[PDB]
Amino acid sequence: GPGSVRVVRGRGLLRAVLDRPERRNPIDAGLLTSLARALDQAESDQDCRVFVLSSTGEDFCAGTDLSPLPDGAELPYWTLLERLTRSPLATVAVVDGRATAGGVGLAAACDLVLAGERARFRLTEVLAGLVPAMALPFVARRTGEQRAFAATLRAEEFDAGAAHRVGLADLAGPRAEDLLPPVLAGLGRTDRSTTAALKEYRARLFPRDARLGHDASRLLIER
Amino acid sequence: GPGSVRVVRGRGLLRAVLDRPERRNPIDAGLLTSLARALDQAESDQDCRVFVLSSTGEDFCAGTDLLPDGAELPYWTLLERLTRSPLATVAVVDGRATAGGVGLAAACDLVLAGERARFRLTEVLAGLVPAMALPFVARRTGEQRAFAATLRAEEFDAGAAHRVGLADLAGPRAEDLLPPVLAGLGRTDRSTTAALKEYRARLFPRDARLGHDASRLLIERFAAPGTG
Amino acid sequence: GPGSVRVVRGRGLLRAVLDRPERRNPIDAGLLTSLARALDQAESDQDCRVFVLSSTGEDFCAGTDLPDGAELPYWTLLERLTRSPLATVAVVDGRATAGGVGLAAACDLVLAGERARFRLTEVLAGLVPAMALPFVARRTGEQRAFAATLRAEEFDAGAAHRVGLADLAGPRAEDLLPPVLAGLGRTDRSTTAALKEYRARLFPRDARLGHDASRLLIERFAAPGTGQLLARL
Ligand SMILES: [Cl-]
Ligand SMILES: [Cl-]
Ligand SMILES: [Cl-]
């Protein structure tokens, strides 16, 4: 039926829209492949400055679609989250629905998270006997270690205001999509060279160790 | 009475109660040994999932009434155990936590704070650096608020503690916040909680020399002339 | 002509006043040298316990108008404000722009009055504020420091207090100082210096960061795009 992701080109921007609302926009190999290709297309256009991740229906992203790992290897979900943090593009998540489990990590790995009245964020992994090890670093770099780990242990649900007050969302309002035009106007005041250097410097100051992607991937598989 | 800790066994849980309300529940070698033994008892029971630290009277814990290379003081070893235990560790704070009493709560996975909860590091007023407690406070509040609160001997009520991350939950009474927290913890298991706490240590580690360095800094400032 | 810094001595304290209000208190080689000399003077006096950085007019500090391992003077000064045995206190009752934000953020305590504004404007000129960012992020956390940089976000006193950029906020930063000094009088220079040393033990900056941060600012000023964005401003 419909492809996992619909791509829309704009002025200096590429939008990837999660486009399976009837399945609650879950993460399958197809979604991860399509989002990577979309970021590749955006990065391959030297005039592109911004990558916008948005969605459809009641669910922004519901996490793994349930319908051995070599020493040193990492799973594709980890790789995609690291790319959203390391892209020369400004990455912007427009959250106007429920982000559940791996869907939280997907939003959190973006440079800016915009949350509307329908936004909800909840890591449900401990209820399935899992540690959300791949998502956690991307949440903890926003919320700090205590709120990320306590929210995991409690499967805490954040609405838009709660997400904004803990740093999981950068901006909050009635509708995330209506927050986007002023964000794009502001990003148009800088350039891709500058945004790239800024995100590379964030990795210099707040690095993730070389073994973490493997260790996080292995912990998710081991359980 | 003289017994620093009373142990209450429960359904999938062990409670350690600081049980010297008239002495204001001070930290002495006896309290630290009794808490370590209670955590040993809880961990040895394979059906135990939760360790609850609670107290009595106006004071949750008033702290202490005022080294070989590589060695760590028992206070350091106990706080590190509360962060690394396979049990979910829960502090129920319905009174004043002062000096080392702050670190004892802060080292727990979840801090519940009631209307009478207060948190204050008073060490700089005695010429001390609270070096052993600070890593467990900063892992909750972040570095700036931990260090600024230490320099200013800042007092936090339950609301202020909740806003800065020192408390995870706040309400009229910390003990009344416990039943829903335990119901929530029942949806996971000890295997998962242990793995989550081990991953927190993987992602946000304390280096292997820190317990010794922190222990030394407290001992060396008891000795400083300005301190007495 | 005009001295960038006016020094005022008090009991237990030395106050460095940025004293060029009609120039908006800009960062130049002279300001950085003068502040380093003031800090030397303050540290040399064994009865000095507090170094107070305060300013004049509408701007606290408007900001600015490599051999291997070398650090720029701005980096050296910010690091000194974090390593000084003195309690370092920024009194912000005006606009802190660009490098001005890092100068406040490197103090142990930031006091913000109603007129305080903090804004990293560097990305609008094609720059990364690499030397100030570690001193901002050690207060706000990485996400708010980097997002505020990407958006050139302006913080008022309330916003700065909520995110940890300011430790204290009130009507006037200058009037939050006497209660802060009364509190600091309950401890001593020995204890303050040991606490700041322990912050460096718990939350260190690696040995190459100052050089890497200094180099990134020099690289960005040389980017072809930088002159065109300055032209835009
Ligand atoms: Cl995960
Ligand atoms: Cl201590
Ligand atoms: Cl800078």
Author numbering:
A (entry chain B): -3 to 63, 71 to 226
B (entry chain C): -3 to 62, 72 to 233
C (entry chain A): -3 to 61, 72 to 239
Provide the authors' own sentences about this structure as they appear in the paper.
The final VirD model consists of a trimer in the asymmetric unit with r.m.s.d. between monomers of 0.2 Å (202 Cα), whose solution relevance was confirmed by SAXS analysis (CRYSOL21). Notably, the interface also incorporates the well-folded helix α10 of the first monomer, which is disordered in the structure of VirD alone.
